[PDB]
Design a protein around this ligand. Sequence first.
Ligand SMILES: Nc1nc2c(ncn2[C@@H]2O[C@H](COP(=O)(O)OP(=O)(O)OP(=O)(O)O)[C@@H](O)[C@H]2O)c(=O)[nH]1
Ligand SMILES: [Mn+2]
Ligand SMILES: [Mn+2]
Ligand SMILES: [Mn+2]
Ligand code: NA
Length: 619
Amino acid sequence: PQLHNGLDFSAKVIQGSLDSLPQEVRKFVEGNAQLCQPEYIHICDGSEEEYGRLLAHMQEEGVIRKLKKYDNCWLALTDPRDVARIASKTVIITQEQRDTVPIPKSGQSQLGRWMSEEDFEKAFNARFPGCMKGRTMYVIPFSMGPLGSPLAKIGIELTDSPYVVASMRIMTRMGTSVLEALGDGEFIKCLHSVGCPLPLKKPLVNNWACNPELTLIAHLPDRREIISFGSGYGGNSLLGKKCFALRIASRLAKEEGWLAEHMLILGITNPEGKKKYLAAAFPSACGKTNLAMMNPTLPGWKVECVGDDIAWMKFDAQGNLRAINPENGFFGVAPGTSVKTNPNAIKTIQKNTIFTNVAETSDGGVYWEGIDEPLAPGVTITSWKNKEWRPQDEEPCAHPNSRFCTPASQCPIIDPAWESPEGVPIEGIIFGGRRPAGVPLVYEALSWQHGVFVGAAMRSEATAAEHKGKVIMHDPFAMRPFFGYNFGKYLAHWLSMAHRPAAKLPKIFHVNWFRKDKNGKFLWPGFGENSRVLEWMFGRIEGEDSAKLTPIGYVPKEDALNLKGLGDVNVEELFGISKEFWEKEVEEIDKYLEDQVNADLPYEIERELRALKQRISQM
Ligand SMILES: Nc1nc2c(ncn2[C@@H]2O[C@H](COP(=O)(O)OP(=O)(O)OP(=O)(O)O)[C@@H](O)[C@H]2O)c(=O)[nH]1
Ligand SMILES: [Mn+2]
Ligand SMILES: [Mn+2]
Ligand SMILES: [Mn+2]
Ligand code: NA
């Protein structure tokens, strides 16, 4: 069917067969093989054999090290220039800027970053041609969600990184069964290159291929495409993790009437054996993963994990808000993780786990700040920078957002319905973040509309490449880095859920684990003690008379919370609501919503802001 042997890359296939791919999958693979000029094409099958060899190869090349203390665990240390998502290089392309972000009255939008089609075409042409020369293009067929679930979506990721392949096997469902399930159906096109064709133009740092200068993570929702160049790390390279999971999915969700959110999903069971599912949106550094796998301090209570990071939610015919975890593993922040703060994570990560940018102990174990396991005298620490490290050094031993990448199936408190194709019925949505002052331990929204306002108004003390130290910033719905489209329209979409006939709208709560006294000490012990707060939400969903009305919403009554074992807890200060603080809070929210959202702000949000101002004025 051709004049030469040009567009057929069969000769370069080293696993699988181009003939076995669906027609549109093949076109995507061969079009990008022509552009990127990889040496080989490896069609991934997801098999155990594929994985072990892939790992052994990366070991054979010094890309990863085997962690000899554990069962089949591996360490990758990156180039320090490639250590997180870079917000300024993360862009969404649409015809009109306003469909992607509201137009800010001053400075930049804090709610997204748009690039024109024209600008993106130029950027793409400056990056991808020839970018995989001398490397293998891996073809990763993957499902976001349980295979065959009506809530699941399929992608194909092309990548030149075996680290991506290994990690995507953990974090998504991938391999031949996905290609079988897909047939000729639609899929998200995911294109990734580390941007270091051979022979290398620049020196390789720490055996970690990347192109910081040209790093660009792009999303083209109208084309169903994600195109990412120059980073090998995390949400920039595992294109399911955030690019698909939140940015593309939230736009699909908008079109199709569902929700794609930065939320954990947990199941909680009381001492009577009654069970409920809760979703919670907190920003990075605010403890979704701790909550999602909680070991509850309260006797007789049980928490089970459905997911720790992404929730895809859609109302079913009965009106239940059904949530799936579209991921297959946990991509968790390592620092701060311990038997104390997260015993169930510790049990999950002892096998078949890939660690990135953590420290290594001389006996081949993992180490990081806050691990709360002292070492035997004589055991030394190699930092994530590959150097020897002593506890009194300036630098930390692990990168502060270093990660583990671990199969979800290995969590000992994994919910037996975590892969159920219909999802789990969410009865409560929880918002929260780090507020050192003013915001009490827990409150409950007065209505759905108020609850959406509470999500919209979220602020949190965030912590390096965008500012020095900790600073309180807006992070509505914990989605500030992740909106697929105009935030004002996202709020409208949330509000519209109230007009679905027979919808069983979840109760909305806001939490604050991080309130501090005058001297900077935490008022609330947190972690497993947060079961006490979950108990109250549970009772509130059951309609128990355990709430006192305040201007910000409902709070627990005096003695409504079980504080047995916690007699030193300053409840006065921890639940205190100051008129002065809240006058300032509503003024600041007003200014932020005006500046950042303006003409796209829904009426209902403006009304909730007025209502809150009014309630505060009567204090
Ligand atoms: N004081 C206090 N700190 C907590 C609590 N729960 C979690 N943390 C802290 O939150 C941090 C861990 O949160 P992360 O794992 O970054 O949060 P996450 O929401 O899972 O973030 P991503 O995985 O990036 O989405 C550590 O600093 C913990 O000490 C709590 O109940 N109280
Ligand atoms: Mn080699
Ligand atoms: Mn997490
Ligand atoms: Mn996250
Ligand atoms: Na390395």
